[PDB]
Design a protein around this nucleic acid. Structure first.
Lengths: 56, 102, 50, 111, 186, 123
RNA sequence: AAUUGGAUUCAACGCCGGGAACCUCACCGGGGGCGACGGCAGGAUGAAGGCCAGGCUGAAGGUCUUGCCGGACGCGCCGAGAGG
């Protein structure tokens, strides 16, 4: 038949479902918001190139 | 003349000190009176994180350091005597801020 | 698609337009004349008969 | 005081503002801030039923509406999640939620 | 925002461009990206064993790389430069990507291991390791460990001194993980 | 327009190609009409110079009145033997069972030659 | 009605969950709906997209009755995609 567009159109103003990462594309899995939105799992793989240091 | 503040921070130790030292050496001799390169704090940033992606058994937990250090420099020179001193190469990776007041 | 849509009437050496032309916007936009309720054509507007 | 409020009729004529001083903190808020674009199509179907154009049996997913004095009388069909469970609305139902009266679980014994 | 966040913003900027360019420039032979960041036009320095692939097959790839750089960033005039890596055999991440292609190709395990070991030891490697975790063409989870000379020590002045290159060499029956850990003289 | 049964004058295979190509420059420089319901208005007011009409329109509603009316307006008509052969010709790569060139633009040396040669023979 | 799933002795049970009112969300109930690229037959004799108004929908021209515009190309299957 005929119908108008959809790409989702519901409220998602805030919460976890609001967020997605810039590496594994998730809502519920982790989003470290410091201007580095990724999951905890990516974070570990990425950091030595970031310049974070393992040492306590 | 115009009292300028060079506020210079860097993410690593070796990169910040070489620029601070070089800035106090080249400026020393010309039409500049310069107050010494003062170290302010390290706003050490702690990210404290869960290693294991299972979150299972014992999970060993990474401590993260991001240390950002800030040297500050007052200087009495022109806006032209300022660019002459801002010629320098500068590590990647070194933020140099300039406020200008009389 | 949906044929047939030849709703413009024919004179002998002229044409005439069956449907109504809108009075909210200017000419160039025809009315789905329901008899009391006018739809719009360019975009889709709830208009009542004047 | 039998019948909740001053009298069933005088709270249909006080609607906007004057009801508020009587109501809970929670019912006030949702009237005062307003309700969603599905709550605007439910103000046509209570109005088709009291008078005029052929009345629909009013159905709703509204479980966040708090019962007003004008809506007392209609038989309201509140979707429990599977099916529509009826509620004949009374004047003792002024000041309670609409999602209270219809169920949120099937009602049986535990064991 | 502040001092703290911006540095992390920049470093996040490094990853999004280093992740894509690796995966593309496996034909070239990817080894790094020296990223010079300015308000005029972001100047990325792509590191390849070979510059003749990165340019492309007639200008296409260098323009393609100029064109996807405008989409990610807000510097719409990003330059491209190709610097050679001076020893690609001293670089492990090159040897990982180079080994991955050869296992993609189907050449046998210990053979595809021997050559690799031999080309980088000739180059000047105090010591070298290749590990290959994977199916190993059956259905048991066993790695094969190819070993010569010194290796990564203890602590962290371990991992800084050595090189380390990782690459998923795809197959059509499964997968094989390609780890190559090089120890340069130092 | 026309049918596959109306053959009143000849349309050579050399004069129908020049009229597929003097209608293609007509859309990419000037103005063109296309879709038969908008064309059934452009020959009749007097906005068309040379009509060109494809031979496959049926049902008849805009096909019984337009062979005797177009000889009374002083306008010549010319045949394409298909809707997909007048469509590609129209300017575009999609059908057009009728067209009305309002304004020759860069087709002007070719649309005065084909409109006297068809009017000479029979409109 | 569904109480999403996985985890299970140490080493599953403040575990994946570093954030479940909608969102999340994968479950249930109800209303509504996209299928690339090729082949095949169809085309502009006007939309594939939009839309009053009732009649229907918990709402959405969504659906029917009903009447119509802006400018111009897409079903049904058959290999075979994107998505999960």
């Amino acid at each position: 038949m005929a119908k108008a567009d959809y790409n989702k159109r519901k409220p998602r103003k805030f919460g976890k479902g609001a967020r997605r990462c810039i590496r594994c594309g998730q809502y519920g899995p982790i989003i470290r918001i410091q201007g580095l939105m990724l999951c905890r799992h990516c974070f570990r793989e990425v950091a030595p190139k970031l310049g974070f240091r393992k040492y306590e | 003349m115009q009292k300028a503040r060079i506020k210079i921070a860097s993410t690593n130790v070796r990169s910040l000190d070489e620029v601070a030292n070089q800035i106090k050496q080249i400026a020393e001799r010309t039409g500049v009176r310069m107050s010494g390169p003062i170290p302010l704090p390290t706003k050490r940033i702690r990210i404290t994180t869960r290693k294991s992606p299972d979150g299972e058994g014992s999970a060993t937990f990474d401590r993260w350091e991001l240390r950002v250090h800030k040297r500050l420099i007052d200087i009495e020179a022109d806006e032209r005597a300022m660019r002459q001193i801002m010629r320098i190469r500068v590590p990647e990776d070194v933020t140099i801020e300039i406020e200008l007041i009389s | 698609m949906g044929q047939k849509w030849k709703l413009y009437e024919i004179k002998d050496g002229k044409v005439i337009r069956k449907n109504k032309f809108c009075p909210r916007c200017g000419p160039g936009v025809f009315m789905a004349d329901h008899g009391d309720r006018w739809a719009c054509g360019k975009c889709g507007y709830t208009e009542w008969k004047k | 005081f039998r019948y909740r409020g001053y009298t069933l009729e005088q709270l249909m004529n006080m609607s906007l503002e004057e009801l508020a001083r009587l109501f809970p903190a929670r019912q006030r808020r949702s009237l005062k801030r307003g309700l969603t674009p599905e709550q605007k199509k439910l103000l046509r179907k209570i109005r088709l039923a009291k008078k005029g154009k052929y009345k629909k049996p009013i159905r709703t997913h509204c479980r966040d509406m708090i019962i007003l004095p004008e809506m007392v009388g209609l038989t309201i069909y509140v979707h429990n999640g599977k099916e529509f469970v009826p509620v004949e609305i009374k004047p003792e139902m002024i000041g309670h939620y609409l999602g209270e009266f219809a169920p949120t679980r099937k009602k049986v014994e535990h064991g | 925002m502040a001092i703290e966040r911006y540095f992390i913003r920049e470093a996040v900027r490094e990853m999004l461009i280093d992740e894509f360019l690796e995966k593309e420039l496996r034909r070239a032979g990817y080894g790094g990206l020296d990223i010079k960041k300015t308000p005029l036009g972001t100047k990325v320095i792509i590191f390849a064993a070979n510059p003749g692939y990165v340019i492309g097959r007639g200008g296409r790839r260098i323009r393609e790389l100029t064109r996807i750089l405008e989409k990610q960033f807000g510097l719409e005039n990003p330059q491209i430069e190709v610097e050679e890596i001076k020893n690609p055999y001293l670089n492990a991440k090159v040897q990982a990507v180079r080994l991955a292609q050869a296992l993609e190709r189907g050449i046998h395990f210990r053979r595809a291991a021997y050559a690799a070991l031999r080309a980088i030891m000739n180059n000047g490697a105090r010591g070298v390791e290749i590990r290959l975790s994977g199916k190993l063409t059956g259905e048991r989870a066993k790695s094969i460990r190819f070993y010569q000379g010194y290796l990564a020590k203890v602590g962290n002045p371990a991992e800084t001194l050595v090189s380390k290159g990782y690459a998923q060499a795809l197959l059509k029956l499964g997968v094989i993980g390609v780890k190559v850990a090089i120890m340069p003289p130092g | 327009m026309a049918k596959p049964s109306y053959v009143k004058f000849e349309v050579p295979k050399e004069l129908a190609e020049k009229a597929l190509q003097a209608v293609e420059i007509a859309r990419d420089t000037g103005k063109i009409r296309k879709g038969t319901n908008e064309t059934t208005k452009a020959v009749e007011r007097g906005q068309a110079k040379l009509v060109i009409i494809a031979e496959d329109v049926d049902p008849e509603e805009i096909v019984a009145h337009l062979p005797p009316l177009c000889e009374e307006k002083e306008i010549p008509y010319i045949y394409v033997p298909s809707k997909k052969e007048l469509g590609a010709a129209a300017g575009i790569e999609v059908a057009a069972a009728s067209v009305a060139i309002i304004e020759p633009g860069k087709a002007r040396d070719l649309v005065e030659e084909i409109a006297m040669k068809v009017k000479e023979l029979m409109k």
